[PDB]
């Protein structure tokens, strides 16, 4: 039977057969403390905080990795599990140097939420005050390694979701550090596409977006609005956090979709930075080298006088934006394509759109769809980039390409 029935903390739970105990747990309602399970990334069993006990079996097993078997009694909260989880959290606090007073993520840290939940009013284990490096060479991301629980959710999100496999582990045992290429700094790395998906995966404030530090906290958000990035065609799904009329943090939903929330630099770094730009909000006028504040009547008069003396003799055009909605573009068509009938209206990328829709048009005559979805370049065997630079055109397509050609054995051949 696929639909199995278990008992977590007395509460009965329902799940698919292959689901782990954590899956059947998060499916119904029940809470199990986790620090290294990122919905999406394959269950990595490193934090050992999700340990649950089966009735009769005196040992404890991780709920993230152990599967659910056809009927069984799982106990998540009792004295011994609370003691062991508090000891694990205290080991993490004692090994690495964790100062919450100045951490960008003090309110979001999942090691801090767990510590407060388990009433960690101490450290118990001797504080090893060793010197882990603070890699803030990258002007966009900062990696403060003395907050690194070592959950590999950043190696896994840059190995299986982004593909530009920049982060891996350095040494063994206690000396294990998360490093960029050849143990270099993130700025010195050639293979970082500066995506930030490493900052969306890090639960423990090691990797932080610098420009929006202390503001892009999810606990201090005024609102959380789900939408779509309008910068490229991939149209990544986003979970924009709004704090006093500005977007402070853009984390990408869609950890179940093939992309995996790895929004690009333009989406995790230009979308929140654009909510803090100059914002005219009053009709200006040139005057020579420096604008002057004008009224709407004055500005539209000086802009329509120049639109009548230049429409009699044809001499008039319009370059609208293709990042505009269909409502706005339909409005612009109402004025420009129909009312005054200008044949000189374009869309700031009209060459690309008209080339694409005049090259694809033969096949529309023949009666086929001459394009597929980008998530199908993940299971392909040979990828051919013809005249493309997908890092500057649609970076999730480039990430798909990288995941394919590294973790799924493809081959790349360019005709550019």
């Amino acid at each position: 039977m696929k639909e199995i029935t278990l008992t977590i903390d007395g509460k009965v739970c329902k799940g698919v057969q292959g689901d782990t105990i954590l899956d059947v747990a998060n499916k119904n309602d029940v809470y199990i403390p986790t620090l290294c399970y990122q919905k999406g990334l394959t269950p990595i069993g490193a934090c050992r905080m999700c340990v649950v006990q089966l009735e009769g079996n005196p040992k404890m097993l991780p709920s993230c990795t152990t599967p659910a078997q056809d009927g069984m009694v799982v106990v998540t909260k009792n004295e011994k599990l609370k003691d062991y989880r508090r000891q694990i959290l205290e080991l993490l606090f004692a090994g690495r140097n964790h100062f919450c007073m100045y951490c960008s993520q003090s309110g979001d840290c999942e090691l801090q939420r767990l510590a407060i939940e388990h009433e960690m009013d101490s450290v118990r284990f001797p504080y090893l005050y060793e010197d882990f490096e603070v890699d803030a060479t990258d002007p966009n991301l900062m990696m403060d390694h003395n907050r690194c629980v070592l959950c590999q959710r950043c190696i896994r999100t840059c190995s299986e979701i982004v593909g530009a496999h920049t982060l891996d582990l350095e040494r063994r045992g206690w000396q294990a550090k998360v490093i960029a290429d050849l143990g270099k700094r993130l700025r010195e790395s050639d293979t970082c596409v500066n995506c930030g998906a490493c900052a969306q995966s890090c639960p423990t404030g090691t990797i932080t977006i610098r420009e929006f530090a202390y503001r892009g906290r999810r606990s201090e958000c005024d609102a959380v609005v789900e939408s779509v990035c309008p910068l490229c065609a991939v149209g990544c799904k986003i979970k924009t956090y709004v704090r006093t009329g500005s977007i402070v943090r853009v984390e990408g939903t869609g950890v179940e979709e093939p992309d995996g929330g790895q929004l690009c630099h333009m989406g995790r770094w230009w979308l929140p930075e654009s909510t803090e730009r100059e914002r005219v909000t009053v009709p200006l006028i040139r005057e020579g080298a420096s604008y002057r504040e004008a009224t709407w009547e004055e500005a539209l008069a000086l802009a329509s006088a120049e639109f009548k003396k230049a429409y009699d003799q044809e001499k008039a055009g319009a370059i609208l934006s293709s990042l505009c909605t269909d409502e706005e573009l339909t409005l612009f068509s109402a004025l420009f394509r129909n009312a005054l009938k200008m044949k000189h209206i374009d869309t700031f990328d009209g060459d690309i759109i008209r080339g694409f829709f005049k090259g694809f048009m033969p096949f529309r005559e023949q009666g086929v769809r001459p394009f597929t979805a980008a998530h199908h370049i993940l299971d392909s065997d040979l990828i051919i980039t013809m005249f493309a630079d997908p890092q500057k055109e649609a970076p999730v397509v480039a990430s798909y390409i990288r995941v394919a050609c590294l973790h799924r054995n493809a081959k790349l051949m360019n005709l550019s």
Binding site: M101, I116, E119, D121, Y127
Partner: protein, 179 residues
């Protein structure tokens, strides 16, 4: 005479954990009507008396502030660690990644328009430093850890209210922060 006998002090604190104690504005009148404040940065006593709830903010960074912490522990029955500086080591512990000689040398000799040409390194009569900043649960057994920078006024009031009723409180999860 029948009032309780708290007595605070700071060791390597920035004074915020007491500033939060004085953030008990109108309720400080009621607390003073319930407890008499022996040795503390508010009263002008110089030697700690025998007390009931000995409070300590700030970690251990010098030698004098280990001695006063040991004194406070020796002279009370419940000790309250105020702040992350006394509970987790705090911000003082940021000097643990460089030696104390280097700490005193970059902040007194090469410190961006200081004008001593002899390398004075001021350890003449003042307590020198400790080689590493530590929490107060390294030389003092603590009974009520109160974490935060600073512990909110509500949390301080709760800890005092529960220690004056005759029990050793553990700060609940709904009102504890590390800030």
């Amino acid at each position: 005479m029948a009032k309780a006998k708290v007595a605070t002090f700071w060791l390597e604190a920035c004074a915020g954990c007491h500033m939060s104690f004085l953030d008990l504005d109108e309720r400080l009148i009621d607390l003073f009507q319930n407890v008499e404040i022996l040795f503390s940065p508010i009263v002008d006593a110089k030697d700690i008396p025998n007390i009931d709830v000995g409070v300590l903010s700030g970690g251990l960074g010098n030698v004098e502030e280990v001695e006063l912490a040991k004194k406070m522990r020796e002279r009370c029955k419940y000790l309250v660690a105020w702040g992350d500086c006394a509970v987790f080591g705090g911000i003082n512990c940021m000097r643990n990644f460089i030696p104390k000689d280097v700490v005193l040398r970059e902040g007194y000799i090469e410190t961006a328009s200081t004008v001593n040409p002899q390398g004075i390194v001021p350890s003449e009569d003042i307590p020198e430093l400790l080689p590493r900043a530590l929490p107060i649960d390294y030389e003092v057994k603590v009974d009520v850890y109160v974490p935060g920078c600073p512990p909110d006024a509500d949390t301080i009031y709760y800890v005092f209210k529960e220690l004056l009723a005759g029990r050793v409180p553990k700060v609940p999860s709904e009102m504890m922060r590390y800030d």
